[PDB]
Structures are given as structure tokens and as C-alpha cells.
Design a protein around this ligand. Structure first.
Ligand SMILES: Cc1cc2nc3c(=O)[nH]c(=O)nc-3n(C[C@H](O)[C@H](O)[C@H](O)COP(=O)(O)O)c2cc1C
Ligand code: SF4
Ligand code: FES
Ligand SMILES: [K+]
Lengths: 151, 513
């Protein structure tokens, strides 16, 4: 993470009403996560306590405090994709990757995440990688999209 | 010099199914044949089993092909794609496809027709006519017109929108806010997504009319983090509208001012709850606020605040453009107007069906959805999202109407419909409902935060066949605990998927028929 650019991200946003989440989004978007060292900088520009700022980071599942793998694969687990097989796809994804949910492959290429609906409920099971969407995903197509990631 | 207009959707569901590759393949193929096309990236018509749905402007109207893959494109050209020639994938004149034609697309009138970001396209189809009329009205008159329309809160609690606006108008305050709830957290819903991706000017117009009606000059669209495409399209649309004078400090030279910005959520379903949303906007954890103050009076930063769902705000322009009475004549009882129903899950022909209230689930399942995708019998349908009850077949004839659903314990909610065929295990659905609650609980209430996890573990005992009669009683007391001690419908409506599964499918829990 680039601490100097973290402080610039924060200072550009310090007068925005309800600035915390936009600041957290911009740090995560550009650095990959919100480093612990960023929290006193956010706290002090926002006249908030470090504890307050940590509490917001931990509350929101979107925000991570350690780097994820090169790719974050999000597998929808909600009811629409359940109905066209999200559960079997979830179990295949773990075996094919070797890691459970919220965890990263041993080669650091993939972090496996659950998501609760991508708004792709008519074309499930749905998967999102970065911001690339995949519909009608079964085991073969999942292996194929993960195949495309590494190379 | 002949140029053929071709439409390839850019809606994220079309994108998930290859729309960009199809557009690039159409472009590459045209270049390889020395033919001139103009590829318009329209919204989706909302017929997702046909996406990517390519359309060609011909003399007979727009004709459609779908679903189109990149490999199909040289064959499409060979069969005369640029003149509407017939092909295995031909669907004919798009507006004649019955699934589309047999709708009442009051709110979704442009979706799939227009380029989402073209102001010319928008304004060629009534875009900003509602605003133009609202600009010539008193604030109280705009409120009265939304009141007379019968519009209700399309986030699912269905509160009468105009009465809510009247409260914000009457409050005395220099600063007032329009807050658009785009958290669309419910599985089986994508109508908000499609508005924001396929017709964002409509959302913008609707919020501007709301701003005029109550005296707000600043708006926020809180949009879930799971919707990156909606966020980027909305920011682009806000920039385009501001630059053309539809937003800013001198809207169309009227002297009226309204500024709009998008805020990204962060993965908490409970931030769909109106006050948890406000907490989030303010940079705090998304904990539901207590209500000694109603948010319409003391909302965002303690200011009077309109909080409405995307579809509620997206319906204001047609209400202004065509008039309250036109809008109010649709529907039945107190459910006036139309709803964009969303056919989802194990459904052969899923997508967006906007119809007047009073259509029955069965009409939607059989006449629009075409049955299940697996081809097996439907066994259960959850309506209204993860907090909705599962309906068995015997409920499929109740009219989709806020009061008739509430009477038997159904939830219209946002209008999402998630179909499960006969393979569904209803004990596991019950487990998931409890699990989903434990994941998303803001944490303020004990049955919601921890009672949920205990429901997961008692359900596990049931799923492994341990003491089913005993543990089901435990789940029911736990549900009664949740109905009676939850500060919001996240805890208070978790029993709805659980109790309907239990009552309608006891055999999946190990109990007698
Ligand atoms: C757990 C929970 C989640 C909710 N999620 C949403 C949502 O995602 N989108 C929405 O518009 N309303 C949602 N609501 C309802 C809002 O609290 C509120 O009723 C609605 O946004 C008001 O706007 P409307 O009157 O136009 O429906 C949720 C409520 C609860 C208790
Ligand atoms: S019911 Fe759950 S989500 Fe709602 S306020 Fe209580 S703990 Fe929070
Ligand atoms: S439930 Fe998976 S995309 Fe909506
Ligand atoms: K995680």
C-alpha cells in the first residue's frame, strides 16, 4: 500500500458529508485493502476515534484489511442461485481451488468469496470476478473461467 | 451510403452472457465484409433467456435475434442479419414477442429501447416531460399529484409515497434531502439494477421531481457494492445530465437547484433498511436507528429526508408526465399502478414483467416464465425476497396485491419471484434463512444476532435426522422470539421463510404428512 497516496485520498475527501465509506472505498480500490496504518490518518482528518474507524471497517463485509489474492472470485449463495444449483457450485469451487470461503489459494491467485445476489437472479448460478460477471455457471464453466484467470 | 443500426444490450445480465464479445464480433464481421453498421449498446428488453438479444432496425421495425453468441455472428450475416433475414435465432419484430407485448411497462417504458446514456434517446421517449410539468407546479401540487396517483413504496413496505413526501414538504428546514435506496439486497430482484443500468435518466428525473416537491437541493443514491455497473452508469448519467442543464444550480434555466451523487454500499444487506442506510451514508456502522424520530422529519444528518426505493422514484416521471388518474386506474384495491415483477430462479423464461397489480403468481409462472428451467414441477416459490414466505401451489391464484398477499402471510415485497422445482430441500431453505440472518444482523437485537445462529444449529440437528419433532418445536419458539423482539424486518421477518417451509413442507423436516 502507498501510505502517501492514502493520506492524499483522505485529505481530498475530508470535508465530504459522511466521508468515511468513500474514503474506505478509494483506499481499497487503489491499494487492495485498508491497512491498519491508514486508520489513525482517517481518524484524525475526520475528527473520529481510531476505534470508531476500525469498527466501521470490520462491520462492512466489502472491506478487507489484508490483501486478497490476485483475483477475488465471488460466488453467489442466495436463493435464486440456490434454486439452479449454487450449493453444488460452491462445493465444487472449494475442491477445485483447495480453499474455503473468505480464503485464498495456496498459489495466491484466487480468493474465494460468497456474495448474496449479484442481481443476476434469472441467469444463475452467478459469479463475479473483479467486475466481470458470469451466468449459468456450472462446474465446467467455473473451471474454465478460473482457467482464464491464471493465464 | 447505407448504415444499418444494430442493438446489442449493455445490461450487466447481457454482459454476463457475452454481449460485449458479440458487439465486437458484429463490428469485426462488418469490417471484414466492408459493411457499415452502427452498434447501439441499448438496455436489456428484460427477456434474459434470449440475452444477448441482438436487434436490427429494419423497415418493419426492430427485429430480434437471441440468444446470440460470438460464434453465431458470421452465420447471422450470411443469413442476412443486416436486412432482418431469418435465422435459427430469429425472434421476429421485438415488440410482438408476447412476453414483452403483454406487459404494462409504465415505469419500464424505455428499457431496452434506448441507449441508456443518450439524452436524445431519453427525450425522444417522454424523457423529462414529467420534470417539465413539475417545474410549472407548486411543491404541494407535486406532492398532491404523487398522492392522487396511489403510488406506494416499491421497496415492499408499500407506504403511500405522497403522504411521505407531504411530511417532508411540511417540515421546516433549510436543508432537505432526497435519498434513493438502491441497496436492492433481495435475491430474486433486479428491477432497481435495470433502472440504474438501462434508464438512469429516469431515476435522475424522478429524484429531481421529488426534490422540487419537498424543497431539497441535494440527493444521494446509495447503491449496493454488488452492483458496480449501476454505479458507473449512474455517475456517467449524472455527469451528462448536469452538463446539459438537467442538474446543477440552474436546471433548464428555471433557477431551481438539485445536486446528485452516488454512494457505494459495502456488503451489508441490512443497509437496505432505511435508517441503517442513513447511518451508512453518515460514515457509521449500518445499525438500525430507533424511531422516536421518523426519518422523513429527522433523517440524513437530522434533516427532513425523502427515502424512496429506485422503482418508487423511477415511477414519478410517468406519474407527472401522464397524470395521477392515468396511473391510478391501473391495479386493484389499494395497490394502484404497476409493478416490475422479476421472474427468477428455476424459471425457463426469466426476466422483467411489469404488470398491473392483480396478476396472479400462476399467470406469471406459466404464461410468462414457461415453467421451470429444469423442466420439473414447481414445488415452492419465495415472493418478496429472502424475508418473503414460500408460497405452495395452492397460493398461486391469490392476486399479487399488497393486501391480499399480507392476509395469508405472503409478501409482495419488491416483486421478486424465485422458483424452486421439486428437488428443493425445504429444511435446508429454513437453515439458510436462519444462516442469512446471522450473517447480516446489524447486531442490535439478541434473537436476530444470536438466536439466528442457534436456529442454524437446531436446523442442522433436523437435517441430520436427529429428534425432528423436538427440534422443530425449538425452531418455532425461536421464530416467535424473533417476531416479538426484532427492531426491524430483518429479524422480524426471518420466521417467514422458516415458518412457511415448516407449515407447507413438514416432510422435509422428518415429520409426518
Ligand atoms: C433488512 C431490510 C432490508 C431492506 N432492503 C431494502 C432494499 O434493498 N431496497 C429498498 O428500496 N428498500 C429496502 N428495505 C425497506 C426500506 O427500509 C424502506 O421501506 C424503503 O426503502 C422505503 O422506500 P419506499 O417507500 O419507496 O419503498 C429494507 C428493510 C429491511 C428491514
Ligand atoms: S432485527 Fe436484526 S437487523 Fe434489525 S435492528 Fe435488530 S439486530 Fe439489527
Ligand atoms: S440470487 Fe444469485 S444473483 Fe440474485
Ligand atoms: K469474506
Amino acid at each position: 500500500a502507498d501510505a502517501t497516496r492514502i493520506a492524499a485520498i483522505v485529505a481530498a475527501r475530508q470535508d465530504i458529508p459522511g466521508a468515511l465509506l468513500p474514503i474506505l472505498h478509494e483506499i481499497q480500490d487503489t491499494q487492495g485493502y485498508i491497512p491498519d496504518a491508514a486508520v489513525p490518518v482517517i481518524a484524525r482528518a475526520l475528527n473520529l476515534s481510531r476505534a470508531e474507524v476500525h469498527g466501521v471497517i470490520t462491520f462492512y463485509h466489502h472491506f478487507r484489511q489484508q490483501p486478497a489474492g490476485r483475483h477475488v472470485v465471488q460466488v453467489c449463495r442466495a436463493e435464486a442461485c440456490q434454486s439452479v444449483g449454487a450449493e453444488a457450485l460452491a462445493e465444487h469451487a472449494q475442491r477445485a481451488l483447495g480453499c474455503g470461503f473468505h480464503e485464498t489459494t495456496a498459489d495466491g491467485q484466487v480468493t474465494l468469496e460468497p456474495v448474496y445476489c449479484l442481481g443476476q437472479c434469472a441467469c444463475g448460478p452467478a459469479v463475479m470476478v473483479g467486475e466481470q460477471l458470469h451466468g449459468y455457471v456450472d462446474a465446467r464453466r467455473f473451471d474454465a473461467l478460473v482457467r482464464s484467470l491464471r493465464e | 451510403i447505407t448504415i444499418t443500426t444494430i442493438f446489442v444490450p449493455r445490461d450487466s445480465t447481457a454482459l454476463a452472457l457475452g454481449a460485449d464479445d458479440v458487439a465486437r464480433a458484429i463490428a469485426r464481421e462488418a469490417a471484414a465484409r466492408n459493411e457499415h453498421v452502427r452498434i447501439v449498446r441499448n438496455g436489456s428488453r428484460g427477456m434474459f433467456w434470449l440475452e444477448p438479444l441482438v436487434e436490427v432496425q429494419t423497415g418493419a421495425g426492430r427485429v430480434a435475434y437471441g440468444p446470440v453468441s460470438a460464434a453465431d455472428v458470421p452465420g447471422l450475416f450470411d443469413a442476412g442479419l443486416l436486412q432482418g433475414g431469418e435465422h435459427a435465432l430469429s425472434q421476429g419484430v421485438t415488440e410482438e414477442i408476447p412476453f414483452l407485448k403483454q406487459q404494462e411497462r409504465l415505469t419500464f417504458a424505455r428499457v431496452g429501447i434506448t441507449d441508456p446514456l443518450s439524452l436524445d434517446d431519453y427525450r425522444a421517449h417522454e424523457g423529462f416531460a414529467g420534470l417539465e410539468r413539475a417545474l410549472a407546479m407548486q411543491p404541494a401540487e407535486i406532492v398532491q399529484e404523487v398522492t392522487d396517483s396511489g403510488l406506494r413504496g416499491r421497496g415492499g413496505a408499500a407506504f403511500p409515497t405522497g403522504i411521505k413526501w407531504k411530511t417532508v414538504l411540511g417540515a421546516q428546514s433549510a436543508v432537505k434531502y432526497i435519498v434513493c435506496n438502491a441497496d436492492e439486497g433481495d435475491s430474486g430482484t433486479f428491477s432497481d439494477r435495470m433502472v440504474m443500468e438501462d434508464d438512469p435518466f429516469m431515476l435522475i428525473e424522478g429524484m429531481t421531481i421529488a426534490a422540487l416537491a419537498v424543497g431539497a437541493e441535494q440527493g444521494y443514491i446509495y447503491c449496493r457494492s454488488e452492483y458496480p455497473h449501476a454505479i458507473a452508469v449512474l455517475e456517467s448519467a449524472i455527469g451528462i445530465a448536469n452538463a446539459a442543464g438537467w442538474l446543477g444550480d440552474d436546471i433548464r434555466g428555471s433557477g431551481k437547484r438539485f445536486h446528485l451523487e452516488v454512494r457505494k454500499g459495502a456488503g451489508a444487506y441490512v443497509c437496505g433498511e432505511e435508517t441503517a442506510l442513513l447511518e451508512s451514508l453518515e460514515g457509521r456502522r449500518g445499525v438500525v436507528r430507533a424511531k422516536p424520530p421518523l426519518p422523513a422529519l429527522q433523517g440524513l444528518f437530522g434533516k427532513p429526508t425523502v427515502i424512496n426505493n429506485v422503482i418508487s422514484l423511477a415511477t414519478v416521471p410517468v406519474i407527472l408526465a401522464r397524470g395521477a388518474q392515468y396511473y391510478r386506474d391501473y391495479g386493484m384495491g389499494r395497490s394502484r399502478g404497476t409493478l416490475p415483477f422479476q421472474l427468477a430462479g428455476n424459471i425457463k423464461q426469466g426476466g422483467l414483467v411489469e404488470k398491473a397489480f392483480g396478476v396472479t403468481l400462476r399467470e406469471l409462472l406459466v404464461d410468462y416464465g414457461g415453467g421451470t428451467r429444469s423442466g420439473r414441477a414447481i414445488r415452492a416459490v419465495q415472493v418478496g425476497g429472502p424475508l418473503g414466505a414460500y408460497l405452495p401451489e395452492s397460493r398461486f391464484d391469490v392476486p399479487l396485491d399488497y393486501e391480499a398477499y399480507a392476509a395469508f402471510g405472503g409478501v409482495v415485497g419488491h416483486g421478486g419471484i424465485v422458483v424452486f422445482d421439486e428437488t428443493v430441500d425445504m429444511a435446508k431453505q429454513a437453515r439458510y434463512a436462519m444462516e442469512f440472518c446471522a450473517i447480516e444482523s446489524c447486531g442490535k437485537c439478541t434473537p436476530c444476532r444470536i438466536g439466528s445462529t442457534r436456529g442454524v444449529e437446531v436446523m442442522d440437528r433436523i437435517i441430520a435426522g436427529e429428534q425432528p419433532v423436538k427440534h422443530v418445536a425449538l425452531v418455532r419458539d425461536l421464530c416467535d422470539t424473533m417476531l416479538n423482539g426484532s427492531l426491524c424486518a430483518m429479524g422480524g421477518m426471518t420466521p417467514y421463510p422458516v415458518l412457511s417451509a415448516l407449515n407447507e413442507f413438514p416432510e422435509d423436516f422428518g415429520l409426518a404428512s
